Design a protein around this ligand. Structure first.
Ligand SMILES: Nc1ncnc2c1ncn2[C@@H]1O[C@H](COP(=O)(O)OP(=O)(O)CP(=O)(O)O)[C@@H](O)[C@H]1O
Ligand SMILES: Nc1ncnc2c1ncn2[C@@H]1O[C@H](COP(=O)(O)OP(=O)(O)CP(=O)(O)O)[C@@H](O)[C@H]1O
Lengths: 431, 431
């Protein structure tokens, strides 16, 4: 089975993966760039291998070097984390072709869900609800395009199949479509929330859905605060969309952890993308289900069945996560530098996922996320109050962080009420 | 209701209490000695009041000064934590007599359970199983003492009613009893485990039991590692002893949080003491029940009912706690001093309850406990592996800690098996 895993990533998720491996007695191989020599997980790994210079293109996206590290250590598997090469079908294809287990879905399934209409295509077949659209590429004859558009109802939105332009009136169609590797047409939702379903699927033909997460708080389409379950969603609705996603997994032959992302508006779900990998915000789902998602990833890659059945999963309580970034809380300019003093919060229902430590220098070369603060409570309110308190205890001296932003979000009356849409944060910042 | 609470304690439990207050929007008043000026919770409290010089006798056991602090702030209540004045009936009596709410049981009930035979007396009446004994003070006529002793069966053990000498043969009775403010006789158990039941009781006449904890790993009768639930204990046995403890609460008029400690041997429970207060190791119970014990303490003092019914409580998974002390791991000599670098562990199922921070100096004046590392897993094994991993990530530079001892305990084959008795640790250390 899995005796040694190459952790093809960095930062907090690399540490998350290391922890999961250690608990399973799996040997860890930390591949890192020269600038990541002092990462907490690198310092804890059983074996370390420099795979290149600081720039991502030369290190963490270096496919030849990553596979060479798996080779010279005798690894059985490679965990891509999220981002970087985790949804690169060439990488997964190349990884299997060299005899290693890729901890994720097969290359074909990544290609499938990596192209937008090809994706919406499969979901439709599987019974997964999609946004009313052209259902396929757009013709260039507008006389007919206007029909589909009027059929589904303005506003519509033109979308790149491998990626956006909003159309409000019929008079601006012809042209809006011209402006660009193809494009489809779809209904534009003005007040949607981001709601996503977590799933697991094994090589024994099983598939389970693990409730949902709401990730509506975003800046430039980048998630900032997430929670679970999604407010307003009943156990009945959960079962419906959840079971549809589970079925779709089997229909498309999915394997490992994945997430179906939907736009949620007026009680309707509309599929927009499947992330064929673990997600950053997976911890909130772990808190409310008791499931260890990364451990399940490893078990599944090992050829084992999911370690529980659907009936075993019950939602309990509520969880929140704040992505703590090294950046100016207003300008969002990255703030690299030495952390002179770190104090991380603790206590009942507080979870801290971070690779940062006092004396650690946050490099400029990669993303700005340095920690994920996660809280759990018996209700949504407790989780929020818990988050607020944990944040105020948190010290990170030496650099700027977005903690002040989180504190603003958490004391927001509308966020406290629940159900704010995907536009709300940028709107509050503007105001 | 409760608007402002005076935290009559220090260290980690003071911080625990502060956190619980903050979540409930209760104002906090931190009373501290001069040496505790830099405690994390003092620095977070809404109001601070120096109540005396470093020595405990002059500060944290200073009843006049503590009540004066409650007065000059207008506090409604005083939380005694554990140790210090938490089981001092004079303090609780004096606290109520001055119009403040004492967050704990009434003075009478503390007196009752504070005297050993008077305690065993009540439990017996309530249906709580006690160790076969003289059931009352020992006569001084041995001709009759030998009857009781032979009745219950050697070995027996003589015990101070306000506190021990073991007797193996009849020939050494007369004398063993002479050696001393009274004493009773009791059966001596050679292979017992320490198993204790957590309870809550409110002023609405309700009482609930919250499963049990096993605290068998001890040195000089001081707990080192605790876990929940107690291995080998079935849901059926749990209900039995648990419901007996709940009933006893009502019979004696108990109020707030408390723990019934038993010796557990060959499937039999034998009451030996009730701690009429929160306990250090309460967190492991919180992890397996989802109950916030300190929040319930506060609600109950506020006159509210326990926020859940017995049926709502289900044991799930398993939890472990390691008491991390500033001491030499072999000699157990305290190791006060500056913590130059702190790194606390995190991740799924890891909880860290500590007032320590990088740059903090551990004073000489008080106990050596600086942190409580708590882990949770879906099974006992996962909890243990989780603890082992968390411990290895933990850095505390500047002073000695007992972390090496914990790591020894956790990799012990017998502890891994489960059910080691109260003598096992001192025995392993000896070997
Ligand atoms: N039909 C629709 N109605 C309303 N908003 C839509 C929409 N279609 C797309 N969007 C918006 O565009 C966003 C996604 O854009 P995009 O196609 O570039 O994916 P993305 O890369 O931004 C998210 P990821 O981080 O998973 O890659 C959605 O989050 C949503 O806010
Ligand atoms: N009948 C018995 N059989 C076996 N061991 C016994 C016993 N009675 C007492 N003991 C031992 O003596 C210990 C308790 O001693 P003691 O009466 O001084 O309370 P204590 O102060 O040590 C515990 P606490 O910290 O709650 O005050 C028990 O933990 C147990 O190990």
């Amino acid at each position: 089975m899995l005796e040694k895993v190459v952790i093809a990533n960095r930062g907090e998720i690399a540490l998350r993966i290391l922890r999961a491996c250690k608990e399973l007695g799996i040997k860890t191989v930390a591949v890192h760039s020269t600038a990541d020599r002092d990462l907490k997980h690198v310092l804890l790994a059983d074996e370390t291998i420099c795979i290149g210079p600081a720039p991502s293109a030369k290190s963490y996206l270096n496919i030849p070097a990553i596979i060479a590290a798996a080779e010279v250590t005798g690894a059985d598997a490679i965990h891509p984390g999220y981002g970087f090469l985790s949804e690169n079908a060439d990488f997964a294809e190349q990884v299997e072709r060299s005899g290693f287990t890729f901890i994720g879905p097969t290359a074909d399934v990544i290609r499938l869900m990596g192209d937008k209409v090809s994706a919406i295509k499969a979901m439709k077949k599987a019974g997964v609800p999609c946004v009313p659209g052209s259902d396929g590429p757009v013709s260039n004859d507008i006389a007919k395009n206007k029909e589909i558009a009027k059929r589904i109802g303005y506003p519509i939105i033109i979308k790149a199949s491998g990626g956006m332009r909003v159309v409000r009136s019929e008079d601006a169609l012809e042209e809006s479509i011209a402006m660009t590797d193809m494009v489809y047409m779809e209904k534009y939702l003005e007040n949607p929330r981001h709601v996503e379903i977590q799933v697991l699927a094994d090589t024994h033909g099983n598939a389970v859905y693990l409730a949902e997460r709401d990730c509506s708080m975003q800046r430039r389409h980048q998630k900032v605060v997430e929670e679970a379950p999604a407010p307003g969603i009943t156990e009945e609705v959960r079962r419906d969309i959840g079971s549809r996603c589970a079925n779709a997994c089997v229909e498309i032959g999915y394997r490992g952890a994945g997430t179906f992302e939907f736009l949620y508006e007026n009680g309707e779900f509309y599929f927009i993308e499947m992330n064929t990998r673990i997600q950053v915000e997976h911890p909130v789902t772990e808190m409310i289900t008791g499931v260890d998602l990364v451990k399940e990833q490893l078990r599944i890659a090992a050829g084992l069945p999911i370690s529980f059945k659907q009936e075993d999963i019950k939602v309990k309580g509520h969880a929140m996560e704040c992505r703590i970034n090294a950046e100016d809380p207003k300008t969002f300019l990255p703030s690299p530098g030495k952390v002179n003093h770190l104090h991380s919060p603790g206590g009942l229902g507080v979870r801290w996922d971070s690779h940062v430590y006092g004396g650690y220098t946050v490099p400029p070369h990669y993303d700005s996320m340095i920690a994920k603060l996660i809280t759990y409570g018996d209700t949504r309110e407790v989780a929020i109050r818990r988050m607020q308190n944990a944040l105020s205890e948190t010290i990170i001296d030496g650099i700027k962080t977005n903690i002040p932003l989180h504190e603003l979000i958490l004391e927001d009356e509308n966020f406290q009420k629940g159900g704010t849409n995907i536009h709300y944060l940028e709107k509050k910042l503007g105001m």
